[PDB]
């Protein structure tokens, strides 16, 4: 447990120092692709649960 949490704290600190590894253009590619998928799938967003909800 102690070792694992150490290397953990290491990886967090290295993720803050070294910045996001996903770069940028890649991330845009992901977001865009997902957008196209949900588009062709007619998926309507899930709204917030209303105060009156019978279920």
């Amino acid at each position: 447990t102690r070792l694992y949490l150490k290397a953990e704290q290491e990886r967090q600190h290295n993720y803050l120092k070294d910045g996001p590894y996903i770069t940028a253009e890649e991330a845009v590619a992901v977001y865009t692709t997902t957008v196209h998928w949900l588009e062709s799938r007619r998926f309507s967003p899930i709204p917030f649960p209303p105060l009156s909800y019978k279920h």
Binding site: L16, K17, G19, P20, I22, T23, A24, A27, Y31
Partner: peptide, 27 residues
């Protein structure tokens, strides 16, 4: 004086990268 030793009174007994900006603004 140099060899004064701080008493070891016992307690038992951060920076950020700017790439986050480029990413977040990109998204």
């Amino acid at each position: 004086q140099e060899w004064k030793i701080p008493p070891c009174i016992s307690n038992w007994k951060v920076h950020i990268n700017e790439n986050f900006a480029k990413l977040a603004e990109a998204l």
